[PDB]
Design a binder for these strands. Structure first.
Ligand SMILES: Nc1ccn([C@@H]2O[C@H](COP(=O)(O)OP(=O)(O)OP(=O)(O)O)[C@@H](O)[C@H]2O)c(=O)n1
Ligand SMILES: OC[C@H]1O[C@@](CO)(O[C@H]2O[C@H](CO)[C@@H](O)[C@H](O)[C@H]2O)[C@@H](O)[C@@H]1O
Length: 578
DNA sequence: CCTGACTCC
DNA sequence: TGGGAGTCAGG
């Protein structure tokens, strides 16, 4: 494969259609080096050194010109890496990573070679082959690097049409071009903006937490009558089941279980298990949300810059890494206070948080076309209280807080394919009763039962299931004669259209929201998405408008057979936006 | 490196 | 024997 190793940018490299590689080898691309550039177009194939291309006003103009279309793989990586250099990338019309992800998330495509494999294209090497793995990872000699980048660009160039053609067959071309690609740009902005952190506050919490860990730790040793590593499920298992001779409720492949659910069930036998649960909760707060967070905060700006992986989950959700900002504590007050350290990036700005209320159950209502479930949402009746009246068979006045919590476990459990065994274990109730709850639920919501039957049948017949905006998940195990394997696939068939349609909806909402913010020239911008919620920051003056704009855009992103409902709060910190 | 903790939706 | 994720310490 012939290419030019160019010393300067020329006009023919700046055609209005090109495959473009802007190579960043560090896995975390924030403020990461760009090691090489390749361009393939109608005129030839070119390798450029970054020092050259990125200092060249004409190349930089071309990068930022939206009418000059680029085909890429992982354009968000390149866009953010370029942002850290103050260079804008526009005109990305095809992203091979996102295309491959839509065609089959299970393939785990994460380099051009793996995408190319999908079309039996082999004139390109895997990145790991060129760079090496782990401690061996290195950028090779220029001629080797240059050929690799050029070959990746040529693969993207040749693969665009084949991938677009299959997406069109799957009814997924608009999902790529109107949803995932625009979202990629929005996520790039979110990651690059980052979220500001009050490190003084975290360091203080950390100091206090260290004190408390020491106290809980020593009390646990007193209760155990021995010192041991409480963070070692192995050592803990000996203490609990050999020394204290507590009952063994569950084993894993390696030994005794010490899961939270097991320890809770052991509470009637020894008080030490409650202390241990507390200690493990505190230790995670310290290790992860204090120490781990502080490790990744950029010290001069005090911002953290997560990476949203847009091409990983099997259902169409995002994930968040380094750090994960989608699992910041909220359920326990001690941990929830971590959110006090997430603050606005400017003076006199505020945090604004908006979340869909029960979007999975509303989606289930839509997809199952269950009259009773649809009517509950159409009239905004409390769905957990409704299910309680049904499973316990009482009037609304007789529903206690605990009954509602159990009904809630039923409501979400059904969505995730729970068995009577799993429900009984989660609620710690008789399995006979758990089975009755499930039987009563399906008697009350017969449309949901038909849905579960139908979607498993569809998966068996077609080999995959689909979401509202035509995302797909293949389920080859659905016809397995093996009960365990088939059962897991049946649960995925039931759940994926629900979880995945919910992901589709919030993604479309982010695009519609961005458009409106820019339309109204507001300074407000997105910081985070947490599956069914959106977190923004804005100058305090803009709260009144956002209180109207954000929930309307979210509720109207798609139109279902039941309303969507969005709650919203704002405050001086993420904690206070409650 | 894998497992089993913890955290979120 | 409930769906989808990431990080951490221990081994
Ligand atoms: N028994 C439960 C309860 C909750 N969840 C999970 O935790 C998420 C958040 O649940 P939650 O906030 O409690 O849902 P709500 O319906 O909004 O609860 P509530 O009306 O009481 O505020 C759910 O989407 C689900 O993924 C679960 O798996 N099992
Ligand atoms: O840039 C995100 C993009 O890159 C991939 C590899 O193609 O994931 C890499 O980067 C992630 C973000 O740092 C890492 O978490 C991951 O380990 C690394 O392979 C894709 O998975 C992805 O969407």
């Amino acid at each position: 494969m012939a290419f030019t190793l160019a010393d300067r940018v020329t006009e023919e490299m700046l055609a209005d259609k090109a495959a473009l590689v802007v190579e960043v080898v560090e896995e975390n691309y924030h403020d990461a080096p760009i090691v090489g550039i390749a361009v393939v177009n109608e005129h030839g194939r070119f390798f450029l050194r970054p020092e050259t291309a990125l200092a060249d006003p004409q190349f930089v103009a071309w990068l930022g010109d939206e009418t000059k279309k680029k085909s890429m793989f992982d354009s968000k990586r390149a866009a953010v890496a370029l942002k850290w250099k103050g260079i804008e990338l526009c005109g990305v019309s095809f992203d091979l990573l996102l295309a491959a992800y839509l065609l089959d998330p299970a393939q785990g495509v994460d380099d051009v070679a793996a995408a190319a494999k999908m079309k039996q294209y082999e004139a390109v090497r895997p990145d790991e082959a060129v760079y090496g793995k782990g401690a061996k990872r290195a950028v090779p000699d220029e001629p080797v690097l240059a050929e690799h980048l050029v070959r990746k660009a040529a693969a993207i160039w040749e693969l665009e049409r084949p991938f677009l053609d299959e997406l069109r067959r799957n009814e997924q071309d608009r999902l790529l071009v109107e949803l995932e690609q625009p979202l990629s740009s929005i996520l790039a902005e979110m990651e690059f903006a980052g979220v500001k952190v009050d490190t003084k506050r975290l360091e203080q919490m950390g100091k206090e937490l260290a004190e408390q860990l020491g106290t809980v730790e020593q009390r646990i040793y007193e209760l155990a009558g021995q010192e041991f590593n409480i963070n070692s499920p192995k050592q803990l298992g000996v203490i609990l089941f050999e020394k204290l001779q507590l009952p063994v409720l569950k084993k894993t492949k390696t030994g005794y279980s010490t899961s939270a659910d097991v320890l809770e069930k052991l509470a009637p036998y020894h008080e030490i298990v409650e202390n241990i649960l507390h200690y493990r909760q505190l230790g995670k707060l310290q290790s992860t949300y204090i120490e781990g967070l502080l490790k990744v905060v950029r010290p001069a700006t005090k911002k953290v810059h997560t990476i949203f992986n847009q091409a990983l989950t099997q259902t169409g959700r995002l994930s968040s890494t380094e750090p994960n900002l989608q699992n910041i504590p909220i359920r326990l007050e001690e941990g929830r206070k971590i959110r006090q350290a997430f603050v606005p990036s400017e003076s006199d700005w505020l945090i604004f948080a908006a979340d869909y209320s029960q979007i999975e159950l509303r989606v289930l209502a839509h997809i199952a076309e269950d009259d009773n479930l649809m009517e509950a949402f159409r009239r905004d009746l409390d769905i957990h209280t409704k299910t309680a009246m049904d499973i316990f068979q009482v009037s609304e006045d007789e529903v206690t807080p605990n009954m509602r919590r159990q009904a809630k476990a039923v409501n979400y459990g059904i969505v995730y394919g729970i068995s009577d065994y799993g429900l009984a274990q989660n609620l710690n109730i008789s399995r006979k009763e758990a089975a009755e709850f499930i039987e009563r639920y399906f008697e009350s919501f017969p449309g949901v039962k038909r849905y579960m039957e139908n979607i498993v049948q569809e998966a068996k017949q077609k080999g995959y299931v689909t979401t509202l905006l035509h995302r797909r998940r293949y389920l080859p195990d659905i016809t397995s004669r093996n009960f365990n394997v088939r059962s897991f696939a049946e649960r995925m068939a039931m759940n994926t259209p629900i979880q995945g349609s919910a992901a589709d909806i919030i993604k479309k909402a982010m695009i519609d929201l961005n458009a409106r913010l820019k339309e109204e020239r507001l300074q407000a911008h997105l910081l985070l998405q947490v599956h069914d919620e959106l977190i923004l920051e804005a100058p305090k003056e803009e709260m009144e408008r956002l209180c109207r704009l954000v929930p309307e855009v979210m509720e109207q992103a798609v139109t279902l057979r039941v309303p969507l409902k969005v709650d919203y709060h704002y405050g001086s910190t993420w904690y206070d936006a409650k």
